[PDB]
Amino acid sequence: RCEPVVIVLRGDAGQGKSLSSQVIAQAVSKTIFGRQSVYSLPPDSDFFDGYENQFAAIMDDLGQNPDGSDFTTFCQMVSTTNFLPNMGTPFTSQLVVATTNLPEFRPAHYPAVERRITFDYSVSAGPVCSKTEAGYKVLDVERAFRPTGEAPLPCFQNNCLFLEKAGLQFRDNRTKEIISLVDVIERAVARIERKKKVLTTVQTLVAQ
Amino acid sequence: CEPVVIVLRGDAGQGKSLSSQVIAQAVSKTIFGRQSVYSLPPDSDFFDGYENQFAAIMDDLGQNPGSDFTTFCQMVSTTNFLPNMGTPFTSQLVVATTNLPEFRPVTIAHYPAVERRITFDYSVSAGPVCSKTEAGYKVLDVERAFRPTGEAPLPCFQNNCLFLEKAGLQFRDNRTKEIISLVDVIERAVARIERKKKVLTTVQTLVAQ
Amino acid sequence: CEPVVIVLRGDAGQGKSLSSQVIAQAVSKTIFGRQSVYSLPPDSDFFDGYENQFAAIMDDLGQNPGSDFTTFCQMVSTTNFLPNMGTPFTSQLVVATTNLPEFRPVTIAHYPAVERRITFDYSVSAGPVCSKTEAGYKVLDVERAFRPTGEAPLPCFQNNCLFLEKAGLQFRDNRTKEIISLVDVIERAVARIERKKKVLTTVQTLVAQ
Amino acid sequence: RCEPVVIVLRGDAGQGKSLSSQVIAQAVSKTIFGRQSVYSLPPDSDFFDGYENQFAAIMDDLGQNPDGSDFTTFCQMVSTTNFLPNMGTPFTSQLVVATTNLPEFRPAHYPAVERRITFDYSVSAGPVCSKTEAGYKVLDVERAFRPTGEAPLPCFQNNCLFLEKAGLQFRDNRTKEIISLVDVIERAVARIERKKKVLTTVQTLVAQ
Numbered sequence A, D: 001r002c003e004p005v006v007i008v009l010r011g012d013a014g015q016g017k018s019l020s021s022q023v024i025a026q027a028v029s030k031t032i033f034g035r036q037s038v039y040s041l042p043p044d045s046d047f048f049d050g051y052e053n054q055f056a057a058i059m060d061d062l063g064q065n066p067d068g069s070d071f072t073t074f075c076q077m078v079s080t081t082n083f084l085p086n087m088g089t090p091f092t093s094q095l096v097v098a099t100t101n102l103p104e105f106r107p108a109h110y111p112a113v114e115r116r117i118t119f120d121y122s123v124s125a126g127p128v129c130s131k132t133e134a135g136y137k138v139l140d141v142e143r144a145f146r147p148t149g150e151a152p153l154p155c156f157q158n159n160c161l162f163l164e165k166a167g168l169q170f171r172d173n174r175t176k177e178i179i180s181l182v183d184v185i186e187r188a189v190a191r192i193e194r195k196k197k198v199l200t201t202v203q204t205l206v207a208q
Numbered sequence B, C: 001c002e003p004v005v006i007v008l009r010g011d012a013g014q015g016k017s018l019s020s021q022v023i024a025q026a027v028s029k030t031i032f033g034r035q036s037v038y039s040l041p042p043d044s045d046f047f048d049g050y051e052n053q054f055a056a057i058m059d060d061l062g063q064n065p066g067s068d069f070t071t072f073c074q075m076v077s078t079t080n081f082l083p084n085m086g087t088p089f090t091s092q093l094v095v096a097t098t099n100l101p102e103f104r105p106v107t108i109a110h111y112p113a114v115e116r117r118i119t120f121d122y123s124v125s126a127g128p129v130c131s132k133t134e135a136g137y138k139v140l141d142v143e144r145a146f147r148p149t150g151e152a153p154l155p156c157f158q159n160n161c162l163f164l165e166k167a168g169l170q171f172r173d174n175r176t177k178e179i180i181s182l183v184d185v186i187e188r189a190v191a192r193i194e195r196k197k198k199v200l201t202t203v204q205t206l207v208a209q
């Protein structure tokens, strides 16, 4: 049970946080595991009924359950120890994606997580897919999915502005760099390949 | 997926029923291409006559002290509700009228679970130009409200009328305390339904399987 | 007979897990001739999958306020432990990682009975050359730790790495306050296991029966 | 119930105290009783469950139980009176071997035992089976069991340095003589044959 790679996506409503979470999970897991393998946690059910050791697991709206059944669920989901979600299936997902409304986290033991959090991104519609709806700025969904040519990675069936920082922007809350969803994926994939290169060097050290 | 839910709160005789019907007729005519509207029989555990209509209307949520309250929370679900009559519930739009100013159901212990389930939460009342006094109370002058005034403001109407305006009939967004017309309501509900569909297609295609 | 017990105390993210595995892989490869390692599933009364592996590892002794503490004292016994799944426990080496600095179990009233049962009692921590700061805390730079540096220092490794040295990863004997490498630990645990076997043969042969 | 012959083996760790205790018990009892007959007391169990009147009985680590459940157990084990260990089987062993870490004994009634103690030996590896292990001097176990010729007594299957003062040394704490394990045995055996010669002269005195 190695530590999973964690991406947290921060943002306001109608910026595509959940769409992105899904499309980050499908595309990282398709690229490495070779297929989509996504479990989406249920909202307000401390029941991972449906979990079949999928490659990627999604949490919607961390820091929305007033009690904290989440956060703890989340904390357990990345301790190198063995979580056992209720039903006895074990928790093994190599990628965890969680979305939240909070610009930062404040639920005492929060910084003890923040090492666990590999990538911290704030999401907001890019300048040429930003629309207004009921007076709010939101991702232009109709414009951001129009096909715009050959896919920028094999796991995509085509390109579109959703995939480019002109359409949707991911601001790395630590490097303060601003990347596309494709970048978000590539970085997540690199880091996993690294964790697998290291792990292989560790189980090949002592001979068999 | 999961349905767009509109709640029309408001006094009685303010056009709760009427707007809930024109909303469901107008959205489904805009999006489906023809009207498609299921009116749930109140005082019926059984969804007799459900034919997987696009829009479904619930008259008077908040009664039978708690069938409706829970048949509601079922209807709005990611999972596949099987009503008593078997058949899945597949409606993309749910309009529910109610009398209360806030909701705290007695069967649904967690009534903050119902609240992320409500896309738009409006309070209906007659507008200044369409409010007559009928036996000492203020109600909607319906006959004035539906008198043709000219070109439909959207193609799914066959003419304009004051009902469509906020001088005739008013909707207070109960979250942005913003006051909009029935047409505004219909436009915003279409935007969402369509935004949802287009996202759903993306989540299902685009990344190879 | 009775097993050699190693306890690896130490902070988390210091290579407790990792060294406990390389110890068990390396000893059993040195002595048995092939790796032979049972990892006890934490949160399991049942030793599901015990196949009489040479080495058995216990991750995180000191939890469930007291199954593990007693399943421990069983495992280390002259008598023949029958775990829940029947089959005898026959492992010659037991590695147990823990978080505490000392042991005073709550089920095992006499916790000075556990202590003659612990052959080696180590405290693990990253070494000076392999300790990066990760989010304000000091942890083991694993990737540096396992980077090949040359010839294996013992034949059961396929190369040397800093993990094997006390610049990479440090073990404080908690009894001689002596500070040794992972290789030192493996060598000392082999010496004992082999010393035990050879004594046992003597006690069973040599005097006629 | 005649008094048993008692050997106490003093020594530091890794000098073969317990190995010796076992091999002294097996070899004295095999020589006289004609078979191995060894009971090893359990550690921290005032329960001689397993005791079936074996010829020799072994105590490990006298002066290690802080309470003194030992010592008393030990004291009772050599009073000519009848000990009854818990279960009602009686205690009859003609040889008692006990090991300890203490260079001397200090647990008030200790000298009252010390008559009971026939042989007091301190054990330490002999000069050509002494090894270093984690910086400590210890008995070279691999070297001390290599067969070195025909056994020096019939109850042994061969000779080895374990059996010789070059391999393992027993210092008689009273004669300050230094003997081998084979000597330790021969002396223990002689003394028992003597106790049996005397006893026979006592039950043959009055005619039948």
Ligand SMILES: Nc1ncnc2c1ncn2[C@@H]1O[C@H](COP(=O)(O)OP(=O)(O)OP(=O)(O)O)[C@@H](O)[C@H]1O
Pocket: A012, A013, A014, A015, A016, A017, A018, A019, A020, A133, A136, A137, A138, A139, B119, B195, B199
């Ligand atoms: N502009 C907006 N203002 C307030 N709430 C909104 C807005 N747009 C959508 N919502 C509602 O608020 C919730 C939060 O939206 P969120 O961004 O988490 O969903 P998404 O799938 O990432 O994007 P979208 O809202 O476009 O579907 C949604 O469930 C939606 O019903």
Ligand SMILES: Nc1ncnc2c1ncn2[C@@H]1O[C@H](COP(=O)(O)OP(=O)(O)OP(=O)(O)O)[C@@H](O)[C@H]1O
Pocket: C119, C195, C199, D012, D013, D014, D015, D016, D017, D018, D019, D020, D133, D136, D137, D138, D139
């Ligand atoms: N050099 C040493 N220093 C400290 N403790 C040791 C050493 N060697 C062994 N031990 C441990 O201390 C205990 C005391 O050893 P003791 O001499 O009583 O056992 P033995 O059977 O006589 O000899 P050995 O220790 O070689 O097995 C043993 O149980 C062993 O686990």
